[PDB]
Structure 1
Amino acid sequence: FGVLAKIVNYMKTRHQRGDTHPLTLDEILDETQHLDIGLKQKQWLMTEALVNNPKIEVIDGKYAFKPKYNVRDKKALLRLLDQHDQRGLGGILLEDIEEALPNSQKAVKALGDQILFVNR
């Protein structure tokens, strides 16, 4: 579990750092200098771990996003939010930061525009 959590975390980290492009297991091993994990483990990770993950995205030959599938939309989630018929599913503050940029600067402007926040 730990290694997978490490894989997810690195993938998250490198993507935030600037690498907004789909990756592979081998590419992670390589970049992390952990390639010598053993072919057996390497294989088991590739064709079972990244299979048992319930949210891992197969783009083709490259694994994609698990926590945020949406694009770098940054500001404005009004169309989704407005939908009072379903409240708007709205967005989590954590999800918003993950999306692109820190919430606060956007929020200050948003608080007088279209968004209201509850601490709950």
Structure 2
Amino acid sequence: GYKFGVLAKIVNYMKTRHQRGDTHPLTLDEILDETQHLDIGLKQKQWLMTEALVNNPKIEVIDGKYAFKPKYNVRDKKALLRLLDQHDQRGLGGILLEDIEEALPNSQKAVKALGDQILFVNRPDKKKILFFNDKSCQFSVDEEFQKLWRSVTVDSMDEEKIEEYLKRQGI
């Protein structure tokens, strides 16, 4: 309606414009014409100019005009690898697979190209979380050893008994 039903179409229309490949920025008035919001309120023009078009993480202010932010979004295979590396280096955390698909068209090519470099963690809702594969220290054993490792129960022992075994065998 008023102050809410007009700003959204500006964002929605702008998103569609980028998909056409037009990286050129657009003015506040120019976007209004194509969004059929030429009659927008006067105090909405300044509010969008001062707050909406700067605070949003998808609006880039260029030479006084506004353009989409594809640089922040992952649109290349190299960017995908770099972003995960920063998350591990800075300990920011993983990213859901859905957040990358929308940002990276045909993300399957990039995900499969990197191969094992991406760690996929499947959530209960089938959502996959991507983490950087730190290849610094790697170690693995056969499933037989891992099953035997689980067969050695340890939560069922107290501290006194656990430490007693050390002197029992002489170590």
TM-score range, shorter chain: 0.5 to 0.7
Distance verdict in 2 for CA 1:54–1:2, change over 3 Å: farther
How far has the Cα of 1:46 moved from its partner?
A: 3.4
Structure 1, residues 80-107: CA drift from partner, whole Å, max 9, x if none? Answer: 4245753764774567657764345315
Structure 1, residues 30-70: CA drift from partner, whole Å, max 9, x if none? Answer: 22343233555445543454356576432222123468635
How far has the Cα of 1:15 moved from its partner?
A: 0.9
TM-score by length of 1: 0.60
- Number of equivalences: 120
- The answer to whether the 8 A contact 1:74-1:100 is kept is no
The CA distance in 2 between the partners of 1:78 and 1:111, in whole Å, is 8
Q: Which runs of 5+ in 1 are unaligned?
A: none
Q: In the alignment, is residue 57 of structure 1 matched against residue 60 of structure 2?
A: yes
Q: In the alignment, is residue 99 of structure 1 matched against residue 102 of structure 2?
A: yes
Secondary structure, counterpart of 1:48 in structure 2: helix
Worse-matched range after superposition: 29-38 or 95-104: 95-104
- The answer to whether the 8 A contact 1:68-1:95 is kept is no
Considering only aligned residues, what root-mean-square deviation do their CA atoms show, in Å? 3.9
The CA distance in 1 between the partners of 2:87 and 2:45, in whole Å, is 48
- The answer to whether the 8 A contact 1:22-1:63 is kept is yes
Distance verdict in 2 for CA 1:7–1:81, change over 3 Å: same
The CA distance in 2 between the partners of 1:57 and 1:112, in whole Å, is 33
* Higher alpha-carbon Rg: 2
